[PDB]
């Protein structure tokens, strides 16, 4: 009573704030009829089928989505499992030769005027004492005048040669779950009017997060994981316009996206057991890709969207929405992935609306690209094989990334314009609730005890 | 830290031709955009050009086409920007910014983190 005496816990409930690094778990599939994910799941253990979430009481806990750790562990993850099933398969070394390309017009619509490249070159056989000459239907993107039937050049090869990708392989996503080494806890918050920062309290330890795809995007966050209640609008600081808006929806948008060009593809040898897998000839008459959205869903939501962005910047001002512009195709378009194609889509004819304080689809063309650089990096590219037969998918938009034009200083006209750039921006989407804690379960405290000698 | 030296500008007759160059210190330019941007007396921050690290590929407004040429060298981490045929609407002062973005949008480069001092450049009678 009027003394007090030191006492020693072990295995207390306490934590801290602390980073490590998070290991995957997929699920299993037998991994049988698996044709060589680039995503390999055979690298990773398999999960539990059986989650746990223990639903914690009485506890507050101070969130911050936009100095998270976690989004630097999983794009460094994904960049390492990614330059890993292009090891092993063909270099486009032999390919920078000068090619000599001119139009093709086998009954082509207006709009595909040109576009497309009839290209004949020369090239190695497997024994290197002979020449072969070949030829080729090269997009427009993808070769580059030289010497200003005139000579042309790939586009990459002045500064990288490129590493064309395994054949057999698929870029389709498929879920990835990250958890955590014995002796740390992921906290997720389970609210609701949660914005990305502050306090949550209401929060719960689960033994790893649900599936995240790793869907590589731009402008438009797509396939995504959609919040209840109402958008959400986050942002690190909605006042300077050098940051993102980034948006969540509420209900998808659905869109489709075809590309009807009747494609044969044809093999070419250029060593010993190497093969180029070259376009060669297009079946009927050439038509230009191109995605298809509604108009009463997306106008509804762009209502929604304007509804909940007037929070901020008064209830009075005008909201108004424009296109994107200048140059550099993978920042200014929507950049997806449908079915081992890369479409670059003109998304004009959605972003134009002025909004005042007081069975129709909208199609959007499309154009494809051969040689891209992901990952962003300095001397690494990828040629993507031709993929024979009409392309059609479908998709699920469920997100935003808007900017905020500004520069009006004292004016009510704040003008919003679409924009992608980083690919981190596509992951802050998906880990904004979660949380890794480092364990520390040494207490002292005092009380009435003595250790007796 | 990042940082940018402006060089060069000053007067010149209208018709010939002029140099500005642009050292950045901190970074190596091979995989970031560098852009050209252009204040008149007056007016807002109005923009000239980049030059991208995506193949090297620049881009110029539509004001300025066949006239200004962005280049850059990466062994001397230096960019140059070559203007011929100036004509008086170029009186202003130019400055080179920068966003360490491995891409460029020709409608971000006026609000950048990093920019430099400027110089001027004069054209009259």
């Known amino acids: 009573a009027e003394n007090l005496w030191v006492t020693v816990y072990y295995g207390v409930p306490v934590w801290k704030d602390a980073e490590t690094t998070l290991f995957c778990a997929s699920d299993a599939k037998a991994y049988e009829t698996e044709k060589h994910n680039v995503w390999a799941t055979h690298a990773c253990v398999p999960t539990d089928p059986n989650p746990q979430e223990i639903h914690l009481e009485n506890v507050t806990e101070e969130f911050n989505m936009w100095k998270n750790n976690m989004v630097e562990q999983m794009h460094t993850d994904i960049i390492s499992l990614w330059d890993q099933s292009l090891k092993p398969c063909v270099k486009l070394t032999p390919l920078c030769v000068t090619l000599q390309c001119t139009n093709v017009t086998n009954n082509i619509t207006d709009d595909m005027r040109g576009e497309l490249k009839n290209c004949s070159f020369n090239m190695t056989t497997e024994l290197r004492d002979k020449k072969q000459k070949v030829y080729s239907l090269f997009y427009r993107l993808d070769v580059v005048q030289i010497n200003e039937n005139k000579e042309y050049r790939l586009i990459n090869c002045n500064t990288s040669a490129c590493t064309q990708a395994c054949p057999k392989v698929s870029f389709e996503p498929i879920p990835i779950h990250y958890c955590a080494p014995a002796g740390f806890a992921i906290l997720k918050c389970k609210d609701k009017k949660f914005n990305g920062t502050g306090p949550c309290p209401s929060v719960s330890t689960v033994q790893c997060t649900h599936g995240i795809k790793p869907v590589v995007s731009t402008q438009l966050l797509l396939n995504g994981s959609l919040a209840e209640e109402e958008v959400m609008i986050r942002s690190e600081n909605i006042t300077n316009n050098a940051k993102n808006i980034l948006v969540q929806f509420n209900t998808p948008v659905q869109i489709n996206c075809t590309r009807p060009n009747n494609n044969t593809r044809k093999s070419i040898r250029i060593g010993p057991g190497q093969a180029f897998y070259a376009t060669g000839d297009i079946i009927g008459d050439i038509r230009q890709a191109h995605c298809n959205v509604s108009k009463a869903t997306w106008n509804e939501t762009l209502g929604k969207v304007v509804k909940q962005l007037r929070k901020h910047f008064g209830n009075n001002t005008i909201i108004r929405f424009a296109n994107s512009s200048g140059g550099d195709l993978e920042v200014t378009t929507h950049s997806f992935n449908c079915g081992g194609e890369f479409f670059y889509c003109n998304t004009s004819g959605l972003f134009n609306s002025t909004w005042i304080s007081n069975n129709d689809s909208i199609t959007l063309p499309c154009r494809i690209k051969q040689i891209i650089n992901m990952w962003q990096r300095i001397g690494q590219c990828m040629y993507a094989p031709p993929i024979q037969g009409v392309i059609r998918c479908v998709s699920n938009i469920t997100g935003l990334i808007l900017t905020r034009d500004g520069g009006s200083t004292n004016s009510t006209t704040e003008t919003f314009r679409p924009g992608g750039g980083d690919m981190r921006d596509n992951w802050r989407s998906e880990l904004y609730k979660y949380k890794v804690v480092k364990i520390e379960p040494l207490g002292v405290a005092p009380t009435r005890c003595k250790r007796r000698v | 830290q990042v940082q940018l030296q402006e060089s060069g500008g000053g007067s010149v007759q209208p018709g010939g031709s002029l140099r500005l160059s642009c050292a950045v210190s901190?970074?190596?330019?091979?995989?970031?955009?560098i852009g050209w941007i252009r204040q008149a007396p007056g007016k807002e921050r109005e923009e000239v050009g980049c030059?991208?690290?995506?193949?090297?590929?620049?881009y110029y407004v539509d004001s300025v086409k066949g006239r200004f040429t962005i280049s850059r060298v990466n062994e001397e981490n230096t960019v140059y920007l070559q203007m011929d045929n100036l004509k008086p609407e170029d009186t202003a002062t130019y400055y080179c910014?920068?966003?360490?973005?491995?891409?460029?949008?020709?409608?971000?480069?006026?609000?950048?983190?990093?920019r430099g001092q400027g110089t001027q450049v004069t054209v009259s009678s």
């Open positions: 901190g970074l190596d330019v091979e995989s970031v955009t």
């Open positions: 910014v920068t966003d360490r973005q491995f891409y460029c949008a020709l409608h971000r480069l006026p609000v950048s983190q990093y």
């Open positions: 030059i991208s690290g995506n193949f090297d590929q620049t």
